[PDB]
């Protein structure tokens, strides 16, 4: 539905930020980013995920992925935290488009592998 499929997309889209430095070891931090997903899930139990899943936890964990490498990964407000800040605006448009306006498969269409029209 919503606020849950976006979290598996957030894993692939944060990987497009953290692996942008060519880091293979950031794919181990994907499993730690999944612990932020559990908190975004927990915000549905308190009805607080309606448009604000967990920006503080997602930003903090995105920055903990930077702190895996500790060399040049921008240890205060990195390009990866800036990437989630800008892409969350575009992703909110693509997700609300998938809610009412299919216009293709479904934003990422399970990595362009879904044989459908609407």
Assess contact for 68 and 15: CB atoms under 8 A.
no
Tokens standing for residue 16: 């497009």
Match 């216009």 to its residue by tokens: 103
DSSP string for residues in 62-109: HHHHHTTT-SSS-SSS-HHHHHHHHHHHHHHHHHHHHHS---SSSTTH
117 vs 51: CA distance, rounded Å: 27
Assess contact for 77 and 71: CB atoms under 8 A.
no
Query: Could you give phi then psi for residue 10, rounded to 5 degrees?
Result: -60, -40
72 burial level (CB within 10 Å; 0-12, 13-18, 19+): exposed
44 burial level (CB within 10 Å; 0-12, 13-18, 19+): middle
CATH architecture under which domain 1-118 falls: Orthogonal Bundle (1.10)
């Amino acid at each position: 539905g919503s606020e849950q499929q976006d979290l598996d997309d957030l894993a692939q889209v944060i990987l497009s930020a953290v692996t942008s430095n060519t880091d293979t070891s950031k794919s181990a931090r994907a499993q730690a980013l999944s612990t932020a997903l559990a908190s975004s899930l927990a915000d549905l139990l308190i009805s607080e995920s309606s448009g604000s899943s967990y920006q503080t936890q997602i930003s903090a964990l995105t920055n903990i992925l930077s702190d895996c490498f500790v060399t040049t990964t921008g240890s205060n407000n990195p390009a990866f935290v800036s990437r989630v800040q800008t892409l969350i605006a575009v992703l909110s448009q693509s997700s609300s488009n998938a809610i009412s306006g299919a216009t293709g498969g479904s934003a990422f269409a399970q990595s362009q592998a879904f044989q459908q029209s609407a």
